Amino acid sequence: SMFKRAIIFTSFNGFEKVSRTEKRRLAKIINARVSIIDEYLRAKDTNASLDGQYRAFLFNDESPAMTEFLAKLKAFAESCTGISIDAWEIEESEYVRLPVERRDFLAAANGKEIFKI
Amino acid sequence: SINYILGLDIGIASVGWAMVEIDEEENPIRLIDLGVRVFERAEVPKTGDSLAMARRLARSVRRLTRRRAHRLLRTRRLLKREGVLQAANFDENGLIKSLPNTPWQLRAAALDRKLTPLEWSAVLLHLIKHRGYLSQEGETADKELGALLKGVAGNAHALQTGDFRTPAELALNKFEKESGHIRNQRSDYSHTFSRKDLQAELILLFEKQKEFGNPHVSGGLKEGIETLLMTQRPALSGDAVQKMLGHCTFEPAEPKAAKNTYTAERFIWLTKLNNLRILEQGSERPLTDTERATLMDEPYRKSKLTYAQARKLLGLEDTAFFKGLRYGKDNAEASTLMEMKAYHAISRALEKEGLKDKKSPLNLSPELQDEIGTAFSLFKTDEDITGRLKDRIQPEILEALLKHISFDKFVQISLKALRRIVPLMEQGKRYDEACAEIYGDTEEKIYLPPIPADEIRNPVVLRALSQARKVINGVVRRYGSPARIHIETAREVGKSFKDRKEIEKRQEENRKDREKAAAKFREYFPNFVGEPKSKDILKLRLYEQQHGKCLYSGKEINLGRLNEKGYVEIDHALPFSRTWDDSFNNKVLVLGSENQNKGNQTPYEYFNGKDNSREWQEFKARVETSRFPRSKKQRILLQKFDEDGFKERNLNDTRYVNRFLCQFVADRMRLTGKGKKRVFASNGQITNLLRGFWGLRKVRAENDRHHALDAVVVACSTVAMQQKITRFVRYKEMNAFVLHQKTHFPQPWEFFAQEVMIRVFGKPDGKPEFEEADTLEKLRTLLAEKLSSRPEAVHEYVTPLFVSRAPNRKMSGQGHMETVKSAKRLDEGVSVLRVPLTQLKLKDLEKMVNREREPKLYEALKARLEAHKDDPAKAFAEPFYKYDKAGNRTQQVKAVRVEQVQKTGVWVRNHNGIADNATMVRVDVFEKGDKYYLVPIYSWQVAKGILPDRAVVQGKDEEDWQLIDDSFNFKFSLHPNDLVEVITKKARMFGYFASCHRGTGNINIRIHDLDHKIGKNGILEGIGVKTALSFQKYQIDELGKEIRPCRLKKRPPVRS
């Protein structure tokens, strides 16, 4: 009924080597959610798109799909020791009411933190 | 005599036609007749090869073997004439008796010893038979021929450098010692020799045999034998290749020629430059004269004039984009835009040999460049080109040019015509203007003349247009000349097989992409009425694409209230009434509240766009910061388009096929049109739109019948109907009140949908479960019951639709299968074939001839095959030998003989082999005692001229069949795709004959419309006609009329 946007920000921890295979895993995870409606957050394999990027995925929090996706993200983050994922959550009402200039940042600020890793 | 419009729907394997009786006012009122005509598309179906290819390859093979045998026959006649065999060393036929079988050895030993008439003859016949490869110079450019050339050149160099002295000696020693064989095998070009080497060897052999005292080294013999070894017919001449292509069509006396030509390349360049327009965010504009002057010479100065490179030259400044360029694709501006291939090919050839200072302009005249292009495009040998350009250019330059250059591909204009056009075009003046200024460009008859094969250079398009011609001519014969002809051709007509395959690929890609999107729509809106249509997914996609913000106001829009009716609308940025454009580039998601004061204005004309009102600047900033593709943003903010031109381009289809068809039908047909074009090529998109909005839902049908449905729609699309539609849309965008509810989108007339559905499918729509009105009675009663309101729904022309399949009564074709098998053991039902080990499978070896007599070999091969999991190519990749009783290795194996089943065949290769039957060309049907007998007739029987005796019997192997005599009554001959009727105990079967199984005597018939509910994919298989009640053959014309049983008098013969 009520639509929630999960803002996920992918950053690089610097600690360890990137492990291109881990980049492929993260690209698969993110690309599972992408469809032609929100293809604009296509997961590339280069750092430029995987490092330091906010992506806001739309979920319907009367469906158990959000939780499985965020759990997969957290599992990968625990695996990768050198990539860090931060998740938030915002109601789509407040997200859309924000000014579209840096919406992902502002929504992250205005949203309940979910998992930091 | 009726006033009607004929609507045609053309595709690669179908033409649907509809007739619409119209007012004098051109409003459609009566649906007269519709049909579908289906044929087989003019290509080899699986691979896209052309039908002519298979025949041409066999023709060239025929000519090659024939000319070789003739050359060898002339060689034997010359041997007899010059004493060498003196008389009757020859057999009953021209072959030499007791000819030795050691010619390689004799050729090598001929250098050191005087030979013998028999040995000398064998040597010369061997040289003639195997005269090696001829260059035909700069041949390094083609997948394999490169590989054969690698082997040839390697062996030539090895002959000249390593001291072995002749092809014979080198071949003997190297090939025998290092490989165990001389002649190449399976695809290998390792041991191939060039003709030059073998000519040198022949000369040396004659010298040596004169030294050693051979009575036959006469000048006659040497002259003759050398000429026989070197001569071959000339390849196609310049004038002959020119006769292949049409006259210029501008200057009939001069030919069309030479893509690789300064004049031709410059024509291409100027056409691109003159037609190239740049769109900057906002509107369009063409290059100023200074910009054209700047770019004009850069294709010569640089290697290629890249689009981004052109941006550099003009200081174009991003926010200025090239039109006719997909800007969504990343680094799209690395595209070429122009490359002068010929100029730079000549220049690179000269640069690479020391005659041209690189990056110094090529000083050769335009005339000389044109001449070089034509010469290199018309001749395929060094000598011919050498003469042509020996007339006009210096020797070193020509020799350099003959190296590195390969030309092809002509361009449909005479160099005189292009010479006149390109000075005219340089001034400016788009192509048609210059062409008309120089030589400005109508004999009508009742029936459309045949389709000119010259203007239609494509087999699939040629067959589609030819069958459209047949449909048209039949319709005109039956009902007179049409008022207008409307045309709708499939997107796939006129596309390369590669193009069509790729289009299918992306169509399936879009299928799965849209299914994922639909799943996402379902997840977001779990409670939804039925299943989501296209506009719903577009609503959601535009919502996310617009940042959740109505594009006209910037007010946030509630998700989940998306399908709350009327809350959000899909607005056409440019109004449909003025552009007839409903692309995905002209659709934005707006609020119901805000989209009520826009009116019929464009987005630029509504936010004022002329005083740069801050509402307009806010809107332009909003659209530029949305996830719209560049094209969409360009269209939203057009500002200055040509209203009528744009709606016209969106209203009709301008493809090569459609323009040709409109001009051809307009020129040479009767067509009592009012006078403005009388032939209309409907744009596919608008036709689909009209189908949807006129109640013609895309059905879930196997029928080729749907082809006629579309043909109806295109036939109702008239100028009056279009303007009525435009008026309705206009009054609808300004909020109509002219009432509100009963304002159905204008239809050609009331209950159009229902009548069209009954007329095409013989069923009221939405009841695919219902039975079809097969007959006039059934159909007319159904129409009068379910359309009692409509007076003209029934009349004297309403007949059930029956799809007409183009027949194929051709009596010719492949005589037998390609591989020839041993026929010795043919009293037993078997034949033998040499099967390589690389192709050897377990079910082959289990039938080896020497399975019993080579138990060691059998067990070795069987065990080896077990290993590597029965993979033939893998198991025997390492050399396999035979073994004696004492364990010694003796001799390799390449291939073993394998038994195969053979109950019938065709005699081949001098009655020394058997080959499998290919395809039956006819089936003769006899009746005796109320039972039916099918005599099959194959093509080799037609060639030999043997009208077969025996009719099929279910299980008997071929010998024991029912011999037909005069006690039987013959009924008819069946060719593929003839209409047949099998009244049987079970039911009544009607359809086009397809196949006649010879192991059962049963036949398959395609249902006329290939309805998938019937049989498997519309084909009734295994119908047994031996014990049918009735078995008759019918006739049918293009339109599906005149369905009558036909009675043949006498059995027809196979030859004339």
Please list every residue in chain B followed by a chain break, i.e. its C lies more than 2.5 Å from the next written N.
136, 441, 737
Measured CA to CA, the distance from residue B792 to residue B765 in angstroms comes to 20
- Following DSSP, what letter does each residue of B816-827 receive, concatenated? B-SS-BB-TTTT
Do residues B718 and B711 make contact, with C-beta atoms less than 8 angstroms apart? no
Structure tokens at A45: 């394999």
Inter-chain Cβ pairs, chain A and chain B, closer than 8 A: 48
Residues B9, B571, B924, B1009: which is the catalytic one? B9
Interface contact A96-B541, CB threshold 8 A: no
Asked whether residue B492 is marked as a ligand-binding residue, the answer is yes
Interacting residues of B179 by C-beta distance below 8 A, sequence separation 6+: B190, B191
H helix count then E strand count, chain A = 5, 5
- Closest Cα of chain A to B544: distance in Å? 7
| Interface residue A12 vs chain B (CB under 8 A) | no
Closest by Cα among B814, B865, B867 to B835: B865
Measured CA to CA, the distance from residue B78 to residue B95 in angstroms comes to 13
Q: Is A86 helix (H, G, I), strand (E, B) or coil?
A: strand
Structure tokens at B479: 């009902």
Q: Is A10 helix (H, G, I), strand (E, B) or coil?
A: strand
Interacting residues of A99 by C-beta distance below 8 A, sequence separation 6+: A106
Closest by Cα among B960, B962, B939, B940 to B949: B962
Interacting residues of B593 by C-beta distance below 8 A, sequence separation 6+: none
Structure tokens at B939: 């093509």
- Give, in order, the Cα–Cα distances in Å from B535 to each of A60, B170, B243, B331: 21, 76, 55, 32
Structure tokens at B987: 């039911």
Interacting residues of B784 by C-beta distance below 8 A, sequence separation 6+: B793, B794
- φ, ψ of residue B372 to 5 degrees: the values are -60, -45
Q: Is B775 helix (H, G, I), strand (E, B) or coil?
A: coil
Measured CA to CA, the distance from residue B1015 to residue B983 in angstroms comes to 17
Structure tokens at B1011: 């309805």
Measured CA to CA, the distance from residue B192 to residue B184 in angstroms comes to 7
- Following DSSP, what letter does each residue of B492-530 receive, concatenated? TTT--HHHHHHHHHHHHHHHHHHHHHHHHHHHH-SS-SS
Q: Pick the residue of A41, A42, A49, A96 with the most B CBs within 10 A to test the interface with B by mutation.
A: A96
- Ramachandran assignment for B4, one of left (phi > 0), alpha (psi -120 to 50 degrees), beta (any other): beta
H helix count then E strand count, chain B = 37, 28
Torsion sign across C-alpha atoms B321, B326, B327, B332: negative
- Angle of helix B534-545 relative to helix B497-524, nearest 10 degrees, comes to 80
The full 3-state SS of B161-180, as one line of letters, equals HCCCCCHHHHHHHHHHHHHC
Listed resolution, Å: 3.5
- Following DSSP, what letter does each residue of B673-709 receive, concatenated? --SS-SEEEB-HHHHHHHHHHTT--------TTHHHH
Closest by Cα among B543, B535, B572 to B560: B543
- Listed in sequence order, the DSSP H helices in chain A are 20-33, 47-50, 65-80, 92-97, 103-109
Interacting residues of B468 by C-beta distance below 8 A, sequence separation 6+: B8, B10, B15, B661
Torsion sign across C-alpha atoms B972, B978, B982, B983: negative
The kind and range of the H/E element at A59 are strand A53-60
| Interface residue B547 vs chain A (CB under 8 A) | yes
CA B378, distance to chain mean position in Å, is 26
- Residue A9, number of CB atoms within 10 A of its CB: 18
Long-range contacts of B20-25 (CB under 8 A, 24+ apart): B20/B712, B20/B715, B20/B716, B20/B748, B22/B483, B22/B718, B25/B720
Structure tokens at B555: 């007010």
Angle, CA B751 vertex, CA B749 and CA B752 arms, to 5°: 60
Judge residue B429's burial from the number of C-beta atoms within 10 Å of its C-beta, 0-12 exposed, 13-18 middle, 19 or more buried. middle
Closest by Cα among B1045, B929, B1036, B952 to B37: B1036
- Whole-angstrom distance between the N-terminal and C-terminal Cα of chain A? 29
- Ramachandran assignment for B858, one of left (phi > 0), alpha (psi -120 to 50 degrees), beta (any other): alpha
- Whole-angstrom distance between the N-terminal and C-terminal Cα of chain B? 44
Q: Residue B908 forms beta bridges with which residues?
A: B913
- Following DSSP, what letter does each residue of B982-1033 receive, concatenated? EE-SS-EEEEEEEEE-TTT-EEEEE-TT--TTTTBTTEEEEEE-TT-SEEEE
Interface contact B548-A95, CB threshold 8 A: yes
Closest by Cα among B160, B185, B187, B186 to B175: B185
Measured CA to CA, the distance from residue B814 to residue B919 in angstroms comes to 7
Q: Is B258 helix (H, G, I), strand (E, B) or coil?
A: coil
- Residue B523, number of CB atoms within 10 A of its CB: 14
- Angle of helix B51-81 relative to helix B117-129, nearest 10 degrees, comes to 160
Structure tokens at B356: 């041209």
Closest by Cα among B364, B363, B362 to B372: B364
Pairing verdict, β B1019-1024 and B1002-1006:
antiparallel
CA R_g for chain B:
37
Q: Is B293 helix (H, G, I), strand (E, B) or coil?
A: helix
Interface contact A3-B549, CB threshold 8 A: no
- Following DSSP, what letter does each residue of B919-936 receive, concatenated? -EEEEEEEESSS-EEEEE
Measured CA to CA, the distance from residue B168 to residue B198 in angstroms comes to 9
| Interface residue B537 vs chain A (CB under 8 A) | yes
Half-sphere exposure of B647 (CA within 13 A, CB side): 13
- Give, in order, the Cα–Cα distances in Å from B572 to each of B336, B551, B569, B582, B595: 35, 12, 9, 7, 10
Q: Residue B55 forms beta bridges with which residues?
A: none
- φ, ψ of residue B189 to 5 degrees: the values are -110, 30
- Residue B486, number of CB atoms within 10 A of its CB: 25
The one-letter amino acid code at B595 reads: N
- φ, ψ of residue B915 to 5 degrees: the values are -135, 155
DSSP B791: G
Interface contact B514-A36, CB threshold 8 A: yes
Do residues B712 and B687 make contact, with C-beta atoms less than 8 angstroms apart? no
Structure-determination technique: X-ray
| B572 assigned to active site | yes
Q: Is B286 helix (H, G, I), strand (E, B) or coil?
A: strand
- List, edge to edge, every strand of the sheet that includes B932-938: B932-938, B920-927, B969-974
Closest by Cα among B856, B820, B846, B840 to B896: B840
Structure tokens at A14: 């610097």
Measured CA to CA, the distance from residue B12 to residue B38 in angstroms comes to 9
Asked whether residue B488 is marked as a ligand-binding residue, the answer is yes
Half-sphere exposure of B825 (CA within 13 A, CB side): 12
Do residues B509 and B703 make contact, with C-beta atoms less than 8 angstroms apart? no
CB-CB: which of A38, A63, A100 is closest to B523?
A63
- Angle of helix B51-81 relative to helix B219-230, nearest 10 degrees, comes to 170
Q: Pick the residue of B506, B512, B513, B524 with the most A CBs within 10 A to test the interface with A by mutation.
A: B524
Torsion of CA B998, B999, B1000, B1005, to 10 degrees: -40
- Listed in sequence order, the DSSP H helices in B302-427 are 307-314, 341-351, 366-378, 382-392, 395-402, 415-427
| Interface residue A97 vs chain B (CB under 8 A) | yes
What is the maximum span of chain A, computed from C-alpha positions, in angstroms? 42
Interface contact B517-A95, CB threshold 8 A: no
Interacting residues of A29 by C-beta distance below 8 A, sequence separation 6+: A43, A69, A72, A73, A76
| B868 assigned to active site | no
Interface contact A92-B559, CB threshold 8 A: yes
The one-letter amino acid code at B466 reads: S
Closest by Cα among B379, B366, B341 to B418: B366
Measured CA to CA, the distance from residue B530 to residue B415 in angstroms comes to 65
Chain B residues 467-526 with CB within 8 Å of chain A: 513-514, 516-517, 519-520, 523-524, 526
Structure tokens at B431: 């192509």
- Following DSSP, what letter does each residue of B92-155 receive, concatenated? SSSPBTT--S-HHHHHHHTTTS---HHHHHHHHHHHHH---B--------STTHHHHHHHHHHH
Measured CA to CA, the distance from residue B908 to residue B938 in angstroms comes to 15
The one-letter amino acid code at B939 reads: S
Closest by Cα among B341, B285, B344, B334 to B312: B334
Do residues A74 and A117 make contact, with C-beta atoms less than 8 angstroms apart? yes
| Interface residue B541 vs chain A (CB under 8 A) | yes
Per-residue b or e along B907-917, where b marks 16 or more CB atoms closer than 10 Å to that residue's CB: ebeeeebbbbb
B chain contacts of residue A65, beta-carbon cutoff 8 Å: 523
- φ, ψ of residue B914 to 5 degrees: the values are -125, 145
- φ, ψ of residue B67 to 5 degrees: the values are -65, -35
- Closest Cα of chain B to A81: distance in Å? 32
Measured CA to CA, the distance from residue B185 to residue B178 in angstroms comes to 15
| Interface residue B134 vs chain A (CB under 8 A) | no
SS3 content of chain A, % helix, strand, coil (to 5): 45, 25, 30
Measured CA to CA, the distance from residue A7 to residue A58 in angstroms comes to 9
Residues B191, B344, B572, B706: which is the catalytic one? B572
Q: Is B186 helix (H, G, I), strand (E, B) or coil?
A: coil
Do residues B799 and B776 make contact, with C-beta atoms less than 8 angstroms apart? yes
Interface contact B625-A40, CB threshold 8 A: no
* Number of residues that this document lists for chain B: 1056
- Give, in order, the Cα–Cα distances in Å from B94 to each of B74, B174, B335: 10, 35, 65
Interface contact A3-B537, CB threshold 8 A: no
Do residues B8 and B488 make contact, with C-beta atoms less than 8 angstroms apart? yes
Q: Residue B895 forms beta bridges with which residues?
A: B836
- Following DSSP, what letter does each residue of B420-472 receive, concatenated? HHHHHHHH---HHHHHHHHH------SSPPPPPTTT---HHHHHHHHHHHHHH
Interface contact B548-A96, CB threshold 8 A: yes
Interacting residues of B904 by C-beta distance below 8 A, sequence separation 6+: B917, B958
- Residue B469, number of CB atoms within 10 A of its CB: 20
B chain contacts of residue A63, beta-carbon cutoff 8 Å: 523, 526
DSSP B1043: -
CA R_g for chain A:
14
Interface contact B524-A95, CB threshold 8 A: no
Measured CA to CA, the distance from residue B880 to residue B857 in angstroms comes to 10
Interacting residues of B260 by C-beta distance below 8 A, sequence separation 6+: B341, B342, B345, B373, B376, B377, B407, B408, B409
CB-CB: which of B537, B559, B625 is closest to A3?
B559
- φ, ψ of residue B692 to 5 degrees: the values are -55, -50
Measured CA to CA, the distance from residue B955 to residue B903 in angstroms comes to 12
